């Protein structure tokens, strides 16, 4: 009989994990401030990591990796990628980005771009702004009042037909207490329902692919959610390639690169408590079938049809591996090249 507490009532994924654990007949939910738990489904902010691992007689596990936030925040990600030699400023799969607070390095980037006779249109961070002249860009940063990064807006995205539409790929990644990196079988493609209009960036619906900002909506697929089998079938018919060869190979390389970089900082291998965490990686693919990393979310929400399967995978892979009870949906990412 294992015990757990719930401290993020707004988590749809771990609400489903709570139901799955109780339905096993071998897990019991305690009051939220009961310290005698085996598992903590913790809050999103100021989680008391310092209080874990000090209960004699209890192996304790938590659904969050302390320090993983420096991957899951816009400004911190650019800092991590540019300063970590494992990734470097020469990193090929991250768009050119610059941290600016309300830089002479970013100003010298557009100064070489637009005055160099090339494309130049970027994006904001944290409502966003897509502009070609930096004057509008920086002016909005000071009006907003938060740290922002200026990132190259992929002017040449891969456009799904029929529709000339834009789109982003969401990958769910589970990292267990042993720091196994598990890529969930099922991704999802959040889609834009409007024709990508390079002429007018004020049209927010054909440039931003957030499921919320798409609120026109649902013409081509339900909920603007295209999944891997159909998208694989599309690239086969349209582009004579597969999802695995043209996209997923890069995605698996980016996921492993990011998490292997921060592993020494966040691993709980020899810690008095243990950590797992579910991540949400968001990718962009251009028309050259090159995959770009846009951001990664530390508390993602699943797709409706995939909730039952992914949350069941979290239990088997992350929770029952530590707390055992009385073909796999994940792809374990590992690579050992000798050089």
């Amino acid at each position: 009989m294992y015990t757990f507490v719930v401290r993020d009532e707004n988590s749809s994924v771990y609400a489903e994990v709570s139901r799955l654990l109780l339905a096993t007949g071998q897990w019991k939910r305690l009051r939220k401030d009961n310290p005698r738990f085996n598992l903590m489904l913790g809050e999103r902010n100021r989680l008391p990591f310092g209080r874990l691992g000090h209960e004699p007689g209890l192996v304790q596990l938590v659904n969050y990796y302390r320090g993983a936030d420096k991957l899951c925040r816009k400004a911190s990600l650019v800092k991590l990628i540019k300063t970590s030699p494992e990734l470097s400023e020469s990193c090929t799969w991250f768009p050119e980005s610059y941290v600016i607070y309300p830089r002479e390095v970013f100003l010298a980037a557009y100064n070489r771009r637009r005055e160099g006779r090339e494309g130049n249109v970027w994006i904001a961070k944290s409502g966003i702004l897509i502009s070609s002249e930096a004057s509008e860009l920086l002016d909005f940063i000071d009006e907003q009042g938060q740290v922002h990064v200026i990132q190259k807006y992929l002017e040449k995205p891969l456009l799904l037909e029929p529709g000339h539409r834009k789109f982003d790929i969401r990958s769910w990644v589970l990292v267990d207490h042993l720091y196994n990196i598990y890529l969930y079988r099922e991704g999802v493609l959040r889609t834009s329902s409007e024709p990508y209009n390079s002429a007018n960036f004020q049209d927010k619906t054909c440039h931003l692919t957030n499921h919320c900002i798409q609120k026109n909506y649902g013409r081509y697929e339900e909920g603007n959610e295209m999944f891997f089998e159909e998208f694989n079938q599309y690239l086969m018919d349209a582009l004579n390639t597969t999802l695995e060869n043209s996209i997923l190979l890069q995605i698996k390389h980016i996921i492993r690169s990011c998490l292997m970089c921060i592993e020494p900082a966040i691993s709980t291998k020899h810690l008095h408590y243990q950590s797992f965490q579910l991540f949400g990686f968001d990718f962009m693919v251009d028309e050259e079938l090159k995959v770009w990393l846009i951001e990664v979310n530390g508390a993602p929400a699943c797709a409706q049809k995939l909730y039952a399967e992914l949350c069941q995978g979290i239990v088997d892979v992350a929770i029952s591996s530590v707390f055992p009870l009385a073909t796999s949906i994940f792809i374990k990412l590992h690579h050992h090249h000798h050089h």
């Binding site: 009989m1 015990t3 305690l30 009051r31 009961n34 310290p35 005698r36 004699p56 007689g57 209890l58």
Partner: protein, 427 residues
């Protein structure tokens, strides 16, 4: 750190004499008072309960009190009656007639100063007196009425010493008189104000254990007192034997009593054994741990699952693995965490004593400060109100000078104590 023991009334002297019988055997003292044990570990803390007499003999620091002479003569007639000091026998000739007013206000008042002179005599010969323990019942007149008057007067002379009681609660299943709810309610009001720790020994629970568990169809008082004796020996094990803990009465009270009025403990013992019945199979540490927490092993007729544990003290006796004890004790708290208040972290303390009690290789004693003890006080209050609403049997008490308003106040204070337990059960 010496303790002064006092037994008052029939029940107090009967369980008191049998307590001295049990621990004298544990420490190797014969009825004459000579030491004939095999280990010097029995004498390391012998001074807590015994004085050293001429001839290197050990005399209990015990005072025997009653308003009736007969029961104290039976004590002197008892197997270990000659061990006690003759000047510590303080008795009247009236008898209290199961009347709290007679014990507290009239007959007992005549004798109480004589008892305090023996208490003073015994305390003056103490290097560092820690406090007093009283054995008595609450249903009669002497141990109830005169015992609580004795407690009040002792607190007046020794206000910084610990006051400890083993108080036997009345039950209709083992009932001598209809006025026992009156005597108990008036006594509980006193104990709430003037004791630091009270072990609630419920005659209802003692009977139920003898009948349902020990398979005794007709339990004598001797059967009931066999459970009381084993329990009293258990809860005093730390005081009487050297161990890793150097515990005393005040440190126990500080750790067990989060609020001054909530100092009534549920005692528990495992394994439950019948008198004379031999135990061939020793319990394991998991068995001891689950029995000592079982409701069937509680000496107070309360359901622990109906309340929450504020604090718990557990005492293991015998040769066993401290690792296994720690694991089993942690297992009980971790698997039953809902029944321990979360606002008192780490509220369970465990001690292990290498010397087991007589006739057992392994044993465990439970001491719980649980809010479920309100069930015991609710039951006494209900039996009190059933008669007080018609002022039934009150003339026995108004003939000794008491007024009905004193009954109302005692009833009110105990209902207040019940509501105070309820407040922390929901907190």
């Amino acid at each position: 750190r010496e303790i002064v023991h006092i037994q008052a009334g029939q029940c107090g002297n009967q369980i008191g004499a049998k307590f001295w019988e049990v621990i004298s055997d544990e420490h190797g003292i014969d009825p004459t008072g000579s030491y004939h044990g095999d280990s010097d570990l029995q004498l390391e803390r012998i001074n807590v309960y015994y004085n050293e007499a001429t001839g290197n003999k050990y005399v209990p620091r015990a005072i025997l009190v009653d308003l009736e002479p007969g029961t104290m003569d039976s004590v002197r007639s008892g197997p270990f009656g000659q061990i006690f000091r003759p000047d510590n026998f303080v008795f009247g000739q009236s008898g209290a007639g199961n009347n709290w007013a007679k014990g507290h206000y009239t007959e007992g008042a005549e004798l109480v100063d004589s008892v305090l002179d023996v208490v003073r005599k015994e305390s003056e010969s103490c290097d560092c007196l820690q406090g007093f323990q009283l054995t008595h019942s609450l249903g009669g007149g002497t141990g109830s009425g005169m015992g609580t008057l004795l407690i009040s007067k002792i607190r007046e002379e020794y206000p910084d010493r610990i006051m400890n009681t083993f108080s036997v609660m009345p039950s209709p299943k083992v009932s001598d008189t209809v006025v026992e709810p009156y005597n108990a309610t008036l006594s509980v009001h006193q104990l709430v104000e003037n004791t630091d720790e009270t072990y609630c020994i419920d005659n209802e629970a003692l009977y139920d254990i003898c009948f349902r568990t020990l398979k005794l169809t007709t339990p004598t008082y001797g059967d009931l007192n066999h459970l009381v004796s084993a329990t009293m020996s258990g809860v005093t094990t730390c005081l009487r034997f050297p161990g890793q803990l150097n515990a005393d009465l005040r440190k126990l009270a500080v750790n067990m009593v989060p609020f001054p009025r909530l100092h009534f403990f549920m005692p528990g013992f495992a394994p439950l054994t019948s008198r004379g019945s031999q135990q061939y199979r020793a319990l394991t540490v998991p068995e001891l741990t689950q029995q000592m927490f079982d409701s069937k092993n509680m000496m107070a007729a309360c359901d622990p699952r109906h309340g929450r544990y504020l604090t718990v003290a557990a005492i293991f006796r015998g040769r066993m693995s401290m690792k296994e004890v720690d694991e089993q004790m942690l297992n009980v708290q971790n698997k039953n965490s809902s029944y321990f208040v979360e606002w008192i972290p780490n509220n369970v303390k465990t001690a292990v004593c290498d010397i087991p009690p007589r006739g057992l290789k392994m044993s465990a004693t439970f001491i719980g400060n649980s809010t479920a003890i309100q069930e015991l006080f609710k039951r006494i209050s209900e039996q009190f109100t059933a008669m007080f609403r018609r002022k039934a049997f009150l003339h026995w008490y108004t003939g000794e000078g008491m007024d009905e308003m004193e009954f109302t106040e005692a009833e009110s204070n105990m209902n207040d104590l019940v509501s105070e337990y309820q407040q922390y059960q929901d907190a």
